[PDB]
Write a structure and sequence with these properties.
part of a larger assembly; 1 chains; about 50 residues; alpha+beta; 1 helix; about 15% strand; RNA-binding; antiviral protein; CRISPR-cas; effector; regulator; CrRNA
Amino acid sequence: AYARWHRSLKNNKGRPYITGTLVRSAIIRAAEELLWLNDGNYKGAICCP
RNA sequence: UAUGUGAUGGAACCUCUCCGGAUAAUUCUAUCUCUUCUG
């Protein structure tokens, strides 16, 4: 659940980054909580579980 | 630099144990210095 470290061949150096899966999971969790608290209707955005 | 119908990692105290201690009167007398030229 943390950021990874890059390592290229040319210099054996890199920079940290965040994969999209972490953001996807966080958005899924937040949307689930929002839909639960809105009883499946948040400003006209009706949804199924 | 992921690959997608599924990530409680905020899901974990560098914590625990150990006398900066021990010994000492702010006291007091013998020289110092080497080359002199027949004596």
